Design a protein around this ligand. Structure first.
Ligand SMILES: Cc1cc2nc3c(=O)[nH]c(=O)nc-3n(C[C@H](O)[C@H](O)[C@H](O)COP(=O)(O)OP(=O)(O)OC[C@H]3O[C@@H](n4cnc5c(N)ncnc54)[C@H](O)[C@@H]3O)c2cc1C
Ligand SMILES: Cc1cc2nc3c(=O)[nH]c(=O)nc-3n(C[C@H](O)[C@H](O)[C@H](O)COP(=O)(O)OP(=O)(O)OC[C@H]3O[C@@H](n4cnc5c(N)ncnc54)[C@H](O)[C@@H]3O)c2cc1C
Ligand SMILES: NC(=O)c1ccc[n+]([C@@H]2O[C@H](COP(=O)([O-])OP(=O)(O)OC[C@H]3O[C@@H](n4cnc5c(N)ncnc54)[C@H](OP(=O)(O)O)[C@@H]3O)[C@@H](O)[C@H]2O)c1
Ligand SMILES: NC(=O)c1ccc[n+]([C@@H]2O[C@H](COP(=O)([O-])OP(=O)(O)OC[C@H]3O[C@@H](n4cnc5c(N)ncnc54)[C@H](OP(=O)(O)O)[C@@H]3O)[C@@H](O)[C@H]2O)c1
Lengths: 459, 459
C-alpha cells in the first residue's frame, strides 16, 4: 500500500493549497471529472466568456438608438463554442500534466471515498477501481453538483444542466429553463441575446429571490417583457416529441420547446464520500467545519462548495488559503491558526441588466433593528448615464443613520460588478458614507459618479 | 447705479456657488456665451456622449472576433448630433431661466470687465453694452479658451476647435488634428470609430506626453497603426482646395484632408478682464490664488480654468465649493476658512484604448527618492480579459517598498475611468497595497480582478 502525507479530493480550489512549504511532502490528488474543477471548465470562466459574446450581439441589436444602423448577419455558434473551450480545454490538460510530472505528487483520476480509520490514526482512501492508500492529512474540496427536481428525473427525459448546455451542437430556437436563480438569469441572458426564444418556469413569483427588494422587483418586471415567465409552476411531467420537449405543469399547463435547461440549484458532494463513518459530521450533504475549516475528524479539512455557506469562487479561494496555512500547524494549536473571513462577501449576476451586491439588503438591516439611511440613484441622473440613454440602471445604498457606516449596496445596471468594488472596499475598512463621498475625487463624467451621487442622496 | 453684494463671472462651476446661505444677498451673474459653461455645452457632457456612440460602432466593427458576424449600414450623424444637443440645449435654457426668475438674481448676458475700484472698496464692473454696476465681492470663473498656433491664424483658412467640430454639418472622410493632447486623442477616437480617416500632426514623438512612461509609449505605437502619425512636425502654412484643406508643414511635407481641428491647448481667460488694474495679479493670463481661492485683490475669489493648475471639472467643482464657504467669512479670517485639496487628483482620457491615472508616474517616484515596488498587469492574464480576448490592456501600480503605500496608478484599457476608482480611494485614505489586495474580496470573474492581481505582483 502507498503512504502519503496529505490527500486532497478535488482539483478546483483544492488545487491551490500546494505552495513552497509543501514541496517535500508526498501528496495524493483525486479528481473524478476534468482537472481544474467547476469554475474553469463548466462554470465561471466559460460562462462569462459566453456572456461577453452575447452582450456584443446585444449591442449590435440596439445600435440604432445611438444613431448607428447595424444588423446581425450570422451567429457562428460553433466558432463561439470552439473559441471559448479551445482555450479552456488545453489548460485542464496541461494543469493535469503539471501535477503528474511531479516526483512527489501522484494523481488519481477516479472517484475517491473514505475508508475505515487505521489504528495509527491515519485515514484510508479507496477509489472506484479498488486502489487503496493511506494519508495522515486529508482535504475535502469535492464541490457541488446540480439539484434536479424529482419529476424530471422520474420521467427519464433528456435534459441539460450548466455542465452540458454550453456545448450544445447548435443554437436552439426555443429553450425552457426551470428555476429562477443565478444560473437561470445568466443563461437566459446568454441565449436570448443570441436569438433563442426563452421560457422560464419558476415555482415562485419572482426572479433572483434573495436579492434586495428593489432589485428583485424591478429585475423581474424587466425580465417579464423580454422572456416568457410561467410563475408559480412546478414541473410534474415531461416527455419527448420528435426533437422537442414537452413540460407538463402542476396546473395542467404545457410548455413545448426544443431543449430544456435545469437550473434549480446545486447540492454539496459531502454525501458521496462515506464521511460520517470516519468522524466527518455532515449537515445533510454539507461537510461541517468550524471557523478554521476544520471538520470534526482530526487532521481533516474542508473548503469550498462542499462546506461553505457561499457558492462563490472568491470565497472558495480564500477558504483554501486558510486551509493552506492551517495544515502546517498543530491540529490543537488553534490560536496559531487563521480564521475564515466571511464579513463582507460580494456577489454578481452576469445577466441583463447586470446585478451586484454586498452587505445587507434593506429588509435585512431593518429586521436587525438598524436606523437606516437609504438612497436609490438612477443611472439617468448622471452624465455617463446620459451617454447611455439609460432608463433602468440603479444603485441602492443603505447606511446607518448614526455613524454613516455602510451597511449594504446593490446595483442593477451597466458594469455592476465593477463600480461596486469601491463600496466593497469602504465596507471592509470602515469608511463612512460621508468620507467616501467627499474625501476623494470622482472623475467627471465617468460611471462611478452614479455611486458618488448615491452616497450624497442618502436620506 | 445698481448695487450688488456678489458678482459671478461665468456660469460653469461658478453657477454652483449659490447655495442656501446666499438667499438674501443681491447677486449679479455674468455670462458671455452659452449658459452652463464649457463642460455642459462644448466639453465633457457632449463629447463623452459622442464617445459612447462611437464605441457602439467599434463594437459592431470587431464583432466577428467574438463569433457574431455583423456590419454597419449607415452612420446617422445628423441624428447623433440632434439626439445629443437635443437634450443639452434645453438644459442650458432652463438653467438660465432659473436664475433670471429669481428676485435676488440679475443675469447679464454680456462680456463683463473690471472697472476702476470705487472709494468704499467696492468693485466696478461694466459689460460690452456699457451697463455698469458695483459689487462688494466678486468671483472670477472665466474658464479658458483654445490656443491656436500662429500659422493657422495667419493663413486665414477655415478651421475647427472643440467648440465647433461637434456640430459640423456632415461627417468628413478625412480629418486632420493638430496637437496631441486630451482633446486630440478623444476626438481622434470619436471620428475614426465612426469611419473617418484620421491624421495627427504633433511636434513631438509621443501622443500622451504627460502620462506615465509606459502608458505614453504603448499608447503611441497603438495609435500609429490605426491613425497616421506625423512626428516632430509643425504647421507653417495652409490653403484651400475646392472643399478640401491642404496643410503645409515645416519640412515641406503636405497633408490633404476635408477639415482641420486644432487641439493645441487652452489659455485662461484672465486677460479679458482688466484684472491687474484692480489689483488682481495675473500669471501670464492665469489669475493667481492662494490655498483659500483668494486672489490678491480684496474680496475677489477665483476658481476653475482661470486659476487652477488643473483643467478638470471635478477640480473646478471642488474649488467652487471652497469659494462657496470662504465667501461667507471675513477676508482676513483665514483660520475659519477651508483650504482647497489638490492631493491625489485623477484624470482620464476617453480614447481607444481608454486611459486613466492618479498619483505619481514611475519616474516621478524615483525622483522623490522612493524605494519603489512596481507592476504591469495584462488584462489578458485575468479571466475577464479572456472573455474580451484582450491583448493590449494594462494596469500599472507604483508603491513604496517599505510601508506598501500607494504612490501612483495608471490604466490603459477597457473601463479605465471606472476600475481606477478603488485606487483613488485607497490613496486618498492611506490604504496600503497589502490591505487593498487581501483585506477585501474581489468579485470573480469581474474586471476589477485585473487591479487585484496588479497589487499582488508588486515586485
Ligand atoms: C454555471 C455556474 C456559474 C458560476 N459562475 C460563477 C461566477 O461568475 N462567480 C463565482 O464567484 N462563482 C461562480 N460559480 C460558483 C463557483 O464555480 C463555485 O463556487 C466553485 O467552482 C467552487 O469551487 P470548488 O473547488 O469548491 O468546487 P469544484 O470546482 O466543483 O471542485 C470539485 C471537484 O472535485 C471533483 N470531485 C468531487 N467529488 C469527488 C470525489 N469523491 N473524488 C474525486 N473527485 C471528486 C469534482 O468532479 C470537481 O472537479 C458558478 C457556478 C456554476 C455552476
Ligand atoms: C473638449 C473638452 C473636453 C473636456 N472633457 C472633460 C472631461 O471629460 N472631464 C473633465 O473633468 N473635464 C473635461 N474638460 C475640462 C472642463 O470642461 C473644464 O475644466 C471646465 O469647463 C472648467 O469649468 P469653468 O467654470 O472653470 O470654465 P467654463 O465652464 O468655461 O466657465 C466659463 C464661462 O464664463 C464665460 N466667460 C469667460 N470669460 C468671461 C468674461 N470675461 N465675461 C463674461 N463671461 C465670461 C465663458 O463663456 C463660459 O461660459 C474638457 C474640456 C474640453 C475643452
Ligand atoms: N455569477 C455568480 O456568482 C453565479 C453564477 C451561477 C451560479 N452561482 C451560484 O451557483 C449556485 C447555483 O445557482 P442556481 O441558479 O442553480 O441556484 P440558486 O441561485 O440557489 O437558485 C435556485 C433556483 O432554483 C429553484 N428551484 C430549486 N429547487 C427547485 C425545484 N425542486 N423545483 C423548482 N424550482 C426549484 C429555486 O426556487 P426557490 O427560490 O423558490 O427555491 C430558485 O429559483 C448558487 O449558490 C449561486 O449563487 C453564482
Ligand atoms: N477627459 C478629460 O479630462 C479632458 C478632455 C479634454 C480636455 N481636457 C483638458 O483640457 C485642456 C486642453 O486639452 P488640449 O488637448 O487642448 O490640451 P493638452 O491636453 O494640454 O495638450 C495640448 C497639445 O497641444 C500641443 N501644442 C501646443 N502648442 C502647440 C503648437 N504651437 N503647435 C503644435 N502643437 C502644439 C501640445 O504639444 P506639447 O505637449 O509638446 O506642448 C500638446 O500635444 C487640458 O488641460 C486637458 O487636460 C481634459
Amino acid at each position: 500500500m502507498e503512504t502519503y502525507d496529505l490527500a486532497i479530493i478535488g482539483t478546483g480550489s483544492g488545487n491551490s493549497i500546494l505552495d513552497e512549504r509543501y514541496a517535500g511532502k508526498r501528496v495524493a490528488i483525486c479528481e473524478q471529472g476534468t482537472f481544474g474543477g467547476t469554475c474553469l471548465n463548466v462554470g465561471c470562466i466559460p460562462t462569462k466568456m459566453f456572456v461577453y459574446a452575447a452582450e456584443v450581439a446585444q449591442t449590435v441589436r440596439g445600435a440604432a438608438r445611438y444613431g448607428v444602423d447595424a444588423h446581425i448577419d450570422r451567429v457562428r455558434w460553433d466558432d463561439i463554442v470552439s473559441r471559448i473551450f479551445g482555450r479552456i480545454d488545453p489548460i485542464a490538460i496541461s494543469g493535469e500534466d503539471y501535477r503528474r510530472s511531479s516526483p512527489n505528487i501522484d494523481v488519481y483520476a477516479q472517484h475517491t471515498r473514505f475508508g475505515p480509520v487505521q489504528p495509527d490514526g491515519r485515514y484510508l482512501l479507496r477509489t472506484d477501481l479498488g486502489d487503496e492508500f493511506t494519508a495522515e492529512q486529508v482535504v475535502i474540496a469535492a464541490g457541488s453538483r446540480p439539484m434536479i427536481p424529482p419529476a424530471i428525473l422520474a420521467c427519464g427525459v433528456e435534459y441539460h444542466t450548466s455542465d452540458t448546455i454550453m456545448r450544445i451542437a447548435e443554437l436552439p430556437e426555443h429553450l425552457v429553463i426551470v428555476g429562477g436563480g443565478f444560473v437561470a438569469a445568466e443563461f437566459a441572458h446568454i441565449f436570448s441575446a443570441l436569438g433563442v426564444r426563452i421560457t422560464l418556469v419558476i415555482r415562485g413569483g419572482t426572479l433572483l429571490r434573495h436579492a434586495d427588494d428593489t432589485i428583485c422587483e424591478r429585475f423581474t418586471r424587466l425580465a417579464s417583457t423580454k422572456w416568457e415567465l410561467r410563475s408559480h409552476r412546478n414541473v410534474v411531467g415531461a416527455h419527448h416529441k420528435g426533437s422537442q420537449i414537452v413540460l407538463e405543469l402542476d396546473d395542467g399547463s404545457t410548455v413545448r420547446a426544443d431543449t430544456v435547461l435545469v437550473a434549480t440549484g446545486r447540492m454539496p458532494n459531502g454525501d458521496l464520500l462515506d464521511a460520517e463513518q470516519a468522524g466527518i459530521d455532515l449537515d445533510e450533504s454539507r461537510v461541517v467545519v468550524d471557523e478554521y475549516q476544520r471538520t470534526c475528524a482530526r487532521n481533516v479539512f474542508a473548503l469550498g462548495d462542499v462546506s461553505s455557506p457561499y457558492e462563490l469562487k472568491h470565497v472558495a479561494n480564500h477558504e483554501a488559503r486558510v486551509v493552506q496555512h492551517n495544515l502546517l500547524c498543530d491540529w490543537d494549536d488553534t490560536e496559531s491558526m487563521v480564521m475564515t473571513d466571511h464579513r463582507y462577501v460580494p456577489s454578481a449576476v452576469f445577466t441583463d441588466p447586470p446585478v451586484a451586491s454586498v452587505g445587507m439588503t434593506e429588509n435585512q438591516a431593518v429586521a436587525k433593528g438598524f436606523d437606516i439611511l437609504c438612497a436609490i440613484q438612477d443611472y439617468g441622473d448622471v452624465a455617463y448615464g446620459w451617454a447611455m440613454e439609460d432608463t433602468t440602471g440603479i444603485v441602492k445604498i443603505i447606511a446607518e443613520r448614526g455613524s454613516g457606516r455602510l451597511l449594504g449596496a446593490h446595483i442593477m445596471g451597466h458594469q455592476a460588478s465593477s463600480i461596486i468594488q469601491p463600496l466593497i472596499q469602504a465596507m471592509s475598512f470602515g469608511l463612512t458614507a460621508q468620507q467616501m463621498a467627499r474625501g476623494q475625487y470622482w472623475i467627471h463624467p465617468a460611471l462611478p459618479e452614479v455611486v458618488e451621487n448615491a452616497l450624497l442622496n442618502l436620506r
